[PDB]
Write a protein that binds this ligand. Structure first.
Ligand code: FCA
Length: 305
């Protein structure tokens, strides 16, 4: 009866696919229809809201393709008597200050970034790399808070663990995907012939994967590369390959939680003016590798591997 939207910036990522899946679940439970829309850019975002209004949706969950669209999104929604909840990516104002007023569901970015770093360092030690000939490549998306806090967290952890600060090289990526990250990593690789072993730091699976792909192209074998993604669900195809690669593992979050919970809260809000908490931080994480990925997915009920 009631129709609620679930707008995602990147429909191609398993992460977002899963959030859609679990929105559908909440829909069945509570008795609402979820309208699933891809919003890969600003225009499509604004158009999509119009479209929702036409369909008579009461509200929407959104992961905006651009945090800086926040103001506009709110203005449009307001106009249509729509309630908004942000998932994953927080709205910011013109100045890049967060819009605290919009309820947000997100991962504990910093904490998860830090776990990445810890796990990078641990695996390095396991392999017995000489620090003197090792480096960290940090592929950054500093314009996105959530991404920033992951990669910063990771670098902080590595530094805390005793990885030499001066051997940490950052490079911005133009896009938060494989192609973008590849390009970025490549440009950094050719700058540093002296490095024999790389740690790859990136905010998510795709970013790290791009990094890994570049290293391979520059004649690094798996043993000499450690990349640990974040998302988990996005990494399955990699972890499924016959042969081990530079991509060691991924930190599996809870896209299920993000999808279901964001939806359920909106409904309660729309249906019963039950005001959501402003901020919901999801702290779940588990390292999945070649050995355990299958169990851990099935254990979290994201079956298939
Ligand atoms: C938790 C999410 O954070 C951002 O939205 C990234 O772009 C996603 O791929 C995902 O990792």
């Amino acid at each position: 009866n009631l129709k609620l939207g679930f707008l995602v910036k990147q429909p191609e990522e398993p992460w977002f696919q899963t959030e859609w899946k679990f929105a559908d679940k909440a829909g069945k439970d509570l008795g609402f229809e979820v309208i699933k829309i891809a919003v890969p850019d600003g225009e499509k975002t604004l158009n999509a809201i119009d479209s929702l209004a036409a369909s008579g949706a009461k509200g929407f969950v959104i992961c905006t393709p651009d945090p800086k669209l926040g103001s506009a999104i709110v203005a449009k929604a307001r106009g249509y008597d729509m309630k908004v909840i942000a998932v994953d990516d927080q709205f910011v104002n013109a100045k890049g200050k967060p819009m605290d007023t919009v309820p947000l569901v997100m991962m504990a970015a910093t904490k998860i970034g830090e776990r990445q770093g810890q796990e990078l360092y641990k695996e390095m030690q396991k392999r017995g790399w000489d620090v003197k000939e090792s480096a960290v490549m940090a592929i950054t998306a500093n314009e996105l808070d959530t991404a920033r806090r992951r990669t910063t967290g990771s670098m902080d952890a590595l530094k805390a663990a005793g990885f030499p600060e001066k051997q940490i090289y950052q490079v911005p990526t133009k896009s938060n995907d494989i192609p973008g990250a590849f390009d970025a990593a490549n440009s950094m690789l050719v700058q540093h012939p002296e490095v024999k072993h790389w740690l790859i730091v990136g905010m998510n699976d795709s970013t790290v994967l791009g990094g890994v792909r570049a290293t391979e192209g520059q004649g690094f074998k798996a043993a000499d590369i450690i990349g640990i993604g974040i998302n988990g669900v996005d990494a399955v195809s990699e972890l499924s390959k016959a042969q081990a690669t530079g991509f060691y593992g991924s930190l599996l979050g809870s896209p299920d939680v993000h999808g279901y919970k964001s939806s359920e809260m909106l409904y309660n809000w729309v249906a019963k003016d039950v005001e959501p908490p402003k901020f919901t931080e999801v702290t779940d994480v588990v390292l999945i590798t070649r050995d355990n990925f299958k169990e851990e997915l099935e254990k979290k009920g994201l079956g298939g591997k």
